[PDB]
Symmetry: C2
Amino acid sequence: DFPPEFEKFWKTVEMNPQDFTGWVYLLQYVEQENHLMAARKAFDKFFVHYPYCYGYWKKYADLEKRHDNIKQSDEVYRRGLQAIPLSVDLWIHYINFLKETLDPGDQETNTTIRGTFEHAVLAAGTDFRSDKLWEMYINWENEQGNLREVTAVYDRILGIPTQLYSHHFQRFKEHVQNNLPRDLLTGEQFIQLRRELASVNGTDPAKLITEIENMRHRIIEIHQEMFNYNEHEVSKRWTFEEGIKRPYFHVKPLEKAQLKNWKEYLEFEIENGTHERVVVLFERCVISCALYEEFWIKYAKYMENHSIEGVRHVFSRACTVHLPKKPMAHMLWAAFEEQQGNINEARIILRTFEECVLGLAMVRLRRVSLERRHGNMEEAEHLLQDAIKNAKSNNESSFYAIKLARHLFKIQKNLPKSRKVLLEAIEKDKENTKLYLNLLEMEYSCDLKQNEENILNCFDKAIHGSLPIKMRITFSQRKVEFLEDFGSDVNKLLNAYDEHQTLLKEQDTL
Amino acid sequence: DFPPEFEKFWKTVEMNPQDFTGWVYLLQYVEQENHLMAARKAFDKFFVHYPYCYGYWKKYADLEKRHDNIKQSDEVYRRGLQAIPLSVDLWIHYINFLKETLDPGDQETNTTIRGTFEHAVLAAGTDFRSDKLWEMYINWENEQGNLREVTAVYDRILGIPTQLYSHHFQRFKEHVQNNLPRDLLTGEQFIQLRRELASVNTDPAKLITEIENMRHRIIEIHQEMFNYNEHEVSKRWTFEEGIKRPYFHVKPLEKAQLKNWKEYLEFEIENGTHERVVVLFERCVISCALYEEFWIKYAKYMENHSIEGVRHVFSRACTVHLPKKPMAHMLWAAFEEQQGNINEARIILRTFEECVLGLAMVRLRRVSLERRHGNMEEAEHLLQDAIKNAKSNNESSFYAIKLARHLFKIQKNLPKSRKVLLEAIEKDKENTKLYLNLLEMEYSCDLKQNEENILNCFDKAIHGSLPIKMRITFSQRKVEFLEDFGSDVNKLLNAYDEHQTLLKEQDTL
């Protein structure tokens, strides 16, 4: 059981999965109809293709909720996060979702929420726009009253840059001001502080007030230093980060200006920031502007430098998912696979690609070139055989035949078979010069003896062709140039000049 | 002692011997000054270069006469005729000259005149415009009264076509009518005729009857022969009248008349006698001597008749009329080789290059000959001197490429071809053809020693510091190569990176 027009929309994506617009139409459709299993099939396939679009994840989950089948909605949020673990907004949606649906009667709820917030920060807290997440964490651990944890959170976050670091600092200052220092720390963290005071100095209520106020100012001094440090590290990156205008993925193409922005900012962190900080920012630059292979490629280069098979994973997410058509990505990936030693996987990369996008230059060329370099020459031949077999354009099949002839003759010798291949190609085309040029270069390459007469056969068949061409006259030129350079007996040169002049005359007649 | 401005005119010819106009001016000058030795030097050299102009022969001879040095004028007429023996007008001038200056008191004069007329006809009487010559002969032997010889003359000419055949026939008819048949023939020629009369079958009326019958029978004979010759005329009338300039002149001919000469030649080739052809062919050489095509077809025809006259024609072609026009010398050296006399063809080539300061076809054919006959040292040295003297950097590059091809493919020694190519590069650096030919060479060997050698060539191409699209095309072809044949992908990828880098740097500029 399905809604009526469903098939129609689906056929569109059945046609071209990259018709994002086709999706958008299908998804508004399935919402307005509110048929579950259809929407599930849809969203599942779509999110396989375009995961980094969180808003549709949220809408998917809100649908499953609308059908009061919550455990599915939890699976949806978790799946989306499994795909994209840096959409601050998505973690926020998951957390607010848990708040909506959890039984405080159970003790474990708060435990799950704690683990969830820790997961969220450990996955995406490093984002320069992850503030409302930290603030949510803070207010959470505050209402629970567990202000020790609140202080731990503030300690963690202030060692990280954000857009609104100053807001967090003023909140921490207010938090210290309006609460009791015994509550804040872990006894030890407290007690040592007290002892430190004593080294400077060398029951009573008012004296206790003095000590508490002094504790406050000392902690303020500590965190003010740390904040100055983080603010400097921010001001380094402020211009860059503000340069971004779209930290979220979207189909619309980016201006080259922001492309330079992402690239130069990436390079900046590469030189100075932590390797961890880099990987974070790099995955971000993958989330936005995922469409552009260039960035994934520079990512692969960086992951090369760190001597990790993550490059492997990276290429998959590039080719397997976002940009399957753009070829240079798959090319570079197969190149890396070859470089390491896992091999047949590269063959399968190529077979899958060509199976998808109907054969291309770089494709068949690289496939043959690898099967060549590793010595399974039979398959290398058969690729070009099938290529000419299935080639669509006569000039295309001619090109494939030229490449086959060159490889076969220069690599596997067997010059006669290259000749026969060329002549097959001729009978197919007859009219394209490149075939004759390659055959002549070939025969000339052999000694001027076995191919002495053969070169003349080639030249004669070129010039005596069915339809006379100005190119045939160029062939007359080159036959004469040959014979004048090297000739057995002048008689041949003289009859050749006769043919040349005769062709000049007939050319002028027509 | 010489006329003043002489040197100037002479330098023009000293400069450009073919400046016909320069001659014409020089000759009006030297005449108007009337200094002998100058005119002799002039006319002699000029006629060496442009003989076929008879009018200047006549003027030369008239000058020598004007200086009352007649023996020289006879030498001049004989010189011109030995050079050109089909100018009817010139023989006519020579004969009228003899009439003007000869002492009839001597008997030998008429003998010389007789021999001269016979020579004239035997050289040029066959011309379709040789009428006034025959008529002059006739009136000559008529005033002398020896009408038997006149009858012989008429017999000869009426077996030949002319523009005015009808004029000759009516003259023959009047000649028979107004003279005595006893006188006309040699008794023998007479008696046989008489005998024929009897086979059909003193008194004055009987004698008159026989004389009139003999006359009418002779007319019958010659009328038949004349009908035959008139047919042979009407075949060639349109052709011969098609000519508008039977005399040589520098001005170039319209292509229409060129076709006329061609097909008329072809006609006589098919029907006329070989001798009858050769006469007309020499005619077609006399006018339009400038056009190598006709001399060439002449040599081709003389091929069929198996005579070294071909040789003669080529000399007269190359040595004289068109020394610069190259296809003539090319074909002549080719024919010389074709016979077996060889070094003469080499000298043909050397003379040409000495004349016109070196050209492609020249060095190409010269080297190819020295090649085919095995003096490979000279074959190298030709291209060596070619590089020595080449004017344009591209010219020396081209000659060097030809040297490399010859040296490697023919004389083996691939290393010397490599070093020669690099010499050519260091000289030029910028010419693409050099790199392409070197690449084809190295590619021809196995993909191994020239794996690295090709890498050196391609590397110099790409790193050549040439801000050119061509450097990028060379990157393209290095990539195409490596994709076609590659040791390890690392090089292909580094090449792809360099290629992209150059794409970007080019786009910046």
